[PDB]
Amino acid sequence: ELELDEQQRKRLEAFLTQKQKVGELKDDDFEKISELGAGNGGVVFKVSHKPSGLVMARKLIHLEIKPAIRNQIIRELQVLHECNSPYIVGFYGAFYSDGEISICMEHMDGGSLDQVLKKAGRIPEQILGKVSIAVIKGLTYLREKHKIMHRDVKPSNILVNSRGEIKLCDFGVSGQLIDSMANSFVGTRSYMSPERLQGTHYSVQSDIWSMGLSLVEMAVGRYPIPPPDAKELELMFGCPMAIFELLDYIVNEPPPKLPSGVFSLEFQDFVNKCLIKNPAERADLKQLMVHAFIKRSDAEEVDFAGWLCSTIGL
Ligand SMILES: Nc1ncnc2c1ncn2[C@@H]1O[C@H](COP(=O)(O)OP(=O)(O)O)[C@@H](O)[C@H]1O
Ligand SMILES: O=C(NOC[C@H](O)CO)c1ccc(F)c(F)c1Nc1ccc(I)cc1F
Ligand SMILES: [Ca+2]
Ligand SMILES: [Mg+2]
Ligand code: NA
C-alpha cells in the first residue's frame, strides 16, 4: 500500500534532481522572501537560496546550545535525506549559525491545514477523506521505512500545495532535538492522546489519536474540547478553558465526537475509532487503511487542488 503511481514517482525524481544540485547550505546563500509563521521555539521563512534559485522554507529554531550539543541534532537530521515519500515534506538540509539551527525544506504553497481551516471555516468531509489517507500513509511510511513515530500530528503540521499534495512535517526524527528543545520550550499538547498526557505507554496509536482529534476540528471549524453545547451546533451546521483545565478534560472526559446527522456514518465511525481513549482498543494504521471511509475515499476522485485554490484564493 506504499506504492507510488506514475505521477508520484515522477514528482519524486524531479525533487531529488533539484536537490542534487544544492551544495552545502550556508546562511549567506539565503534571502528572506516572507515570514511563513512563528512558533514557541522558532520562526519559518519562505526564502530563496540564491545560488540554485530554489525557494524553500527556512525554519530557524533559535535554541541555544554549545556547538558540541547542536552538532548531534544536525547529525540525526541528516536522516531526513533518507525520508522520500509523497506524504512527507521534502528536506534540503540543516546547519547551525548565529546560535540557531536552520532546517530548510520544500516550500508548501497552500500552507498548513491550520490556515486552510481559518480561511475555509470548515473542511468538507470528502476533502478530509484525502487528508486522512495522506496522514495514514505518511505515518505508515515513517514507521515502515524508518521506525519513526511522528509524535506531533496536528493541523499546523499537515501542509498542502497547489498541486493537490498533502505532506507531514515536524516529526520526531532527532530525539536529541526533541530533548534539547522539548525542555525549555513547550509546543501545545492540546492534540496529545490521553495516554501521553497521563505519562503512560505510547506508540503510533498516539499519532492516530491526534489525527482523529484534528479531523473533528477541521470538520466542525473549531478545536473540539470541551464539547459544543447543542445550541452551539445549530449556529454551526443549521441544527473559557485554561490549558491545564483542558488537558485534564481530555484525560477525564469522554472523547470528542462529530455532531450526528451532518456527516456520513462511515466518517463518524472512522473518527470514533481514532478517538478511542484506550490505545489497545483504538484502531491502528493497518485497520484504518481498510476502513470503509478510507476505501470509499480512495475510489472517490476528489479534486483537492481545485477545492484548495478556490478556498484560499490560490
Ligand atoms: N514547509 C513549509 N511550507 C510552508 N509553510 C510552513 C512550512 N513549514 C512551516 N510552515 C509554517 O510555519 C508556521 C509555524 O511553524 P512552526 O514553527 O513549526 O509552529 P507550529 O508548527 O507550532 O505552527 C506553521 O503553522 C506553517 O504555516
Ligand atoms: O521542528 C520540529 N518541531 O516543531 C518546532 C517548533 O514548533 C519551531 O517553532 C521538530 C521536532 C522534532 C524533530 F525531530 C524535528 F526534526 C523537527 N523539525 C522537522 C522535522 C521534519 C521535517 I521534513 C522538518 C522539520 F523542520
Ligand atoms: Ca551570516
Ligand atoms: Mg510545524
Ligand atoms: Na543569518
Question: What is residue 36's three-state secondary structure?
Answer: strand
Q: Residue 115 annotated as binding?
A: yes
Q: Are 282 and 273 in contact (CB under 8 A)?
A: yes
Does residue 205 have a known ligand-binding role? Answer: no
- Residues framing ligand 2 (Cβ under 6 A): 39, 41-42, 59, 61, 80, 89, 91, 103, 105, 169-174, 177-178, 187
d(CA 49, CA 29): 5
145 in a labelled binding site: no
Neighbours of ion ligand 4 (CB under 5 A): 156-157, 170
Q: What does the alpha-carbon distance between residue 313 and residue 130 come to, in Å, rounded to a whole number? A: 20
Helices (H) and strands (E) in the chain, counts: 13, 8
Give me the residues paired with residue 33 across strands. none
Q: Which residues contact 275 (CB under 8 A, 6 or more apart)?
A: 209, 212, 213, 216, 255, 256, 257, 282
- The number of residues in the chain equals 314
Q: Which ligand is nearest to the CA of 190?
A: 1
Name the residue of 54, 92, 112 whose CB sits within 8 Å of the most ligand 1 atoms, as the mutation to test its pocket: 112
Which sequence spans correspond to the domains of the chain? 1-109, 110-314
C-alpha dihedral over 248, 156, 267, 128, to 10 degrees? 170
Q: What string of DSSP letters covers 174-236?
A: -HHHHHHHSSS-----TT--HHHHS----STHHHHHHHHHHHHHHHHTS---S---THHHHHH
CA distance 251 to 301: 38
Cα 8 to ligand 2 centre (Å) = 24
Please tell me whether 310 is known to bind a ligand.
no
Residue 170 assigned to a binding site: yes
Q: Are 252 and 172 in contact (CB under 8 A)?
A: no
Residue 28 CA to ligand 5 centre (angstroms): 7
Query: Which helix (H) or strand (E) segment is 135 a member of?
Result: helix 125-146
- Residue indicated by cell numbers 505515518: 139
Report the separation in Å between the CA atom of 59 and the middle of ligand 4, taken as the mean of its atom positions: 9
Report the CATH number of the 1-109 domain: 3.30.200.20
Q: Are 188 and 226 in contact (CB under 8 A)?
A: no
What is the DSSP pairing of strand 54-61 with strand 101-105? antiparallel
> Under CATH, to which class is 110-314 assigned?
mainly alpha
The CA 26 to ligand 3 mean position distance, Å, reads 8
Nearest ligand to the C-alpha of residue 31? 5
Output the ligand 1 site: residues, CB below 6 A. 36-37, 39, 42, 44, 57, 89, 105, 107-108, 111-112, 114-115, 156-157, 159, 169-170, 187
Q: Which of 88, 152, 156, 188 should be mutated for ligand 1, with most atoms under 8 A from CB?
A: 156
Cβ-based burial of 158 (10 A; exposed 0-12, middle 13-18, buried ≥19): buried
Catalytically annotated residue among 27, 109, 152, 207 = 152
The question of whether 29 is a catalytic residue gets the answer no
Cell of 160: 498542502
